[PDB]
Ligand binder design. Structure first.
Ligand code: HEM
Ligand code: HEM
Ligand SMILES: Cc1cc(N)nc(COc2cccc(OCC3CCNCC3)c2)c1
Ligand SMILES: Cc1cc(N)nc(COc2cccc(OCC3CCNCC3)c2)c1
Ligand SMILES: C[C@H](O)[C@H](O)[C@H]1CNc2nc(N)[nH]c(=O)c2N1
Ligand SMILES: C[C@H](O)[C@H](O)[C@H]1CNc2nc(N)[nH]c(=O)c2N1
Ligand SMILES: [Cl-]
Ligand SMILES: [Cl-]
Lengths: 362, 362
């Protein structure tokens, strides 16, 4: 049955991929080649063209992503050749470097060898290649609470964090055959961080807030034509709200809204004063201002929504069905000021796509 | 089949209603009475107790309502006895008066005779008993655009609006047997309006904004035990965002955000300045402040969310399944600052409930 799934998915993908690439006539021969290869080896190997476009199609089908307009300009790095943890580490290091691009962020995906028969060749433990550690012990909470479990797992493996609020987690991944994952400290020269300041309010720097430049999802599975790339880290640039309205605002994250209200000089006593709402706006203005001042790529949620509208138009123009998750597409601040809020979306799963997978820790 | 639907719904409602009222033992006899009455007349008549609790159950099942905590304190006015348009008008006038309660708004529903065999006894054309007219002609737009079609329909019937931005629409409803609906101008002494001022910014009054005190939905069908009350106007108090973030903010409504940005002294040039977001906050602070200053009941979205959390707890406590529409429950500003955003809801339709129905105009 597993083979049948692979072949069925392969047929659907190769047809669709080759149609889009204008290689329609080559479908029959390519499928035959694949049909034998599956019959022989229990799997098949993508061409670079199929892989590159498959990763682009997968971004295009990401229902929760508001930034899908630029799906076709995705930078794909093919690292199916890696065999050693040294190679994995250097690929991950390289991904950070080239994607960061001195602030002018390049949407990039590095693709590692896929699962053979459910067996992972490489298993990345990081949720993001760049993320802050989190600590919770006897009342004392430090750093990013969302990283508490991974941090504890890393401290099992001989790593120790400095316990600032912004400890960079090391890269941690496990190779096929090894029982334990290895970990490597990130070179600080590879990680751009942005100090959060406010354009008008000088006291905002007293919060001593900062965030990393590049969000690189590293725990999701890329599925292309029945092939499971469990290790394929990808990145874009931040939408400001992700940092200002969530990472730094959520009670179960950095929980900074009360201190923001204090530095911007407003009371945090009454719900009717809408101080949380005011704090969210100024903090999100601070985030956008800070990234721009440092020359690190970022987009506000209004501009992002406009771009997503173009994506919707582009999709209809090309005769493709649009899919999307309304609950995720709406920004967490002023969503009714975007068009997204005022229309509906089909939340169907189309492949190729990126999927969740179980954590090896926890 | 229609009778079978009525009887099936009647069985489900009477059982459930009487369980909750602790009148469990009376279910059998009451159902027999109903079974004969349906067999005889093609319908059945609710007791005052069933009607009152049915309307309360219906509010409790309103998936899109964030204010369901106070479902059991709903003030039910039984006007199934009305036969004349004079009686309908005076009932509607009375509803406005008693619900307004000099600002201390009482959640109230006035229930008119139900459909007999799909035939409406009374047909209310108003979307809300109190709403502003809207005009669009050769480029010129005046008032509330959402009322454009109803306003045009009213001006067919001999009514004429003054064409201010806040013309009160007349009550307009049609009686069984009449081809045309009648219309009655609202007494201004019955309608509380709130001038919008800002607590800190004096120039906000230059916008000359205002809104009516009491939102009274009048075009929805209340369904109770198979009985269709197509005319049953209900009201609560406003959540501030409904006015500040939607009615006065939407481009297809009053579209006031640019003028708000001007009076609060910020530029409306760059998306990255988040001026819309800032304008939304100050305008919503203005709305809340204004209603409080006038002693007209209103609730901010944070407090409302807290109350809705209690409703969720109350529901689990009493062993009732919770249903809700996530897309409607989240407030249009700072939704991620509420618990609603961070959990999911089953959007199943439970009866009794309130439903949409076709407009007689349009
Ligand atoms: C170009 C800049 C990009 C922007 C501004 C953007 C924007 C967003 C945002 C705001 C989210 C929601 C994240 C959250 O709430 O946690 C998101 C989710 C997502 N984006 Fe993008 N994105 C970008 C690039 C990409 C790229 C390059 C890919 C992959 C090829 C991608 C795939 C996804 C996926 C899979 C999710 C869902 C993750 C999840 O389920 O939690 N995006 N995007
Ligand atoms: C007590 C004060 C109340 C508050 C603060 C409240 C809050 C809300 C809000 C904010 C909405 C969304 C409206 C919109 O976005 O257009 C809503 C919808 C709704 N509420 Fe309530 N509500 C209250 C009382 C009531 C009452 C008394 C009923 C009926 C018995 C009711 C039934 C509904 C229904 C049926 C809807 C959905 C209307 C639609 O589908 O568009 N609510 N409520
Ligand atoms: C590619 C990208 C761009 C962007 N602007 N922002 C992001 C952030 O995306 C996130 C941020 C946090 C969680 C998440 O979901 C992936 C995990 C998978 C395991 N379950 C929890 C969610 C995805 C990514
Ligand atoms: C009872 C109540 C309380 C409250 N705070 N706010 C409202 C406002 O509710 C609305 C406000 C606008 C539209 C609407 O929906 C009913 C119509 C039915 C016909 N289709 C369009 C929506 C419901 C009601
Ligand atoms: C398409 C989408 O369902 C629509 O814009 C909804 C979203 N959530 C909402 N929520 C409320 N309270 N009121 C609304 O009118 C809407 N509109
Ligand atoms: C329960 C609900 O789906 C959950 O809170 C979602 C809502 N929408 C979201 N949207 C984004 N972009 N990111 C999120 O983490 C969430 N969380
Ligand atoms: Cl993030
Ligand atoms: Cl309204």
């Amino acid at each position: 049955e597993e083979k049948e799934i692979l072949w069925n998915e392969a047929k659907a993908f190769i047809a669709a991929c080759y149609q889009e690439l204008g290689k329609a006539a080559e479908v029959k021969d390519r499928l035959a080649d694949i049909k034998s290869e599956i019959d022989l080896t229990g799997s098949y190997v993508h061409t670079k063209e199929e892989l590159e476009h498959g990763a682009k199609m997968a971004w295009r089908n990401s229902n929760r992503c508001i930034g899908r307009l630029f799906w076709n300009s995705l930078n794909v790095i093919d690292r199916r050749d890696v065999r050693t943890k040294e190679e994995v580490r250097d690929a991950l290091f390289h991904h950070i470097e080239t994607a960061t691009n001195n602030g002018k962020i390049r949407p990039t995906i590095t693709i590692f060898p896929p699962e053979e028969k459910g067996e992972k060749q490489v298993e990345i433990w990081n949720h993001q290649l760049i993320r802050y550690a989190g600590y919770e012990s006897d009342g004392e909470r430090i750093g990013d609470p969302a990283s508490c479990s991974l941090t504890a797992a890393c401290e099992e493996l001989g790593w120790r964090g400095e316990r600032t609020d912004f400890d960079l987690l090391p890269l941690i991944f496990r190779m096929k055959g090894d029982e334990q994952p290895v970990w490597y400290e990130l070179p600080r020269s590879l990680v751009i961080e942005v100090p959060i300041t406010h354009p008008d309010i000088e006291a905002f720097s007293d919060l001593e807030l900062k965030w990393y430049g590049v969000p690189i999802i590293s725990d999701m599975k890329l599925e292309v034509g029945g092939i499971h790339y469990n290790a394929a880290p990808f990145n874009g640039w931040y939408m400001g709200t992700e940092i200002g309205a969530r990472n730094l605002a959520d009670e179960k994250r950095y929980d900074k809204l009360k201190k923001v209200a204090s530095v911007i000089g407003i009371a945090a006593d009454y719900n009717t004063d809408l101080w949380k709402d005011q704090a969210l706006v100024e903090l999100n203005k601070a985030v956008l201002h800070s990234y721009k001042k440092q020359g690190v790529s970022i987009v506000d949620h209004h501009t992002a929504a406009s771009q997503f509208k173009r994506f919707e138009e582009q999709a209809e123009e090309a005769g493709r069905k649009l899919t999307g998750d309304w609950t995720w597409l709406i920004p967490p601040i002023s969503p009714a000021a975007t068009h997204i809020f005022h229309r509906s979306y089909d939340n169907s799963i189309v492949k190729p796509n990126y999927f969740y997978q179980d954590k090896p820790y926890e």
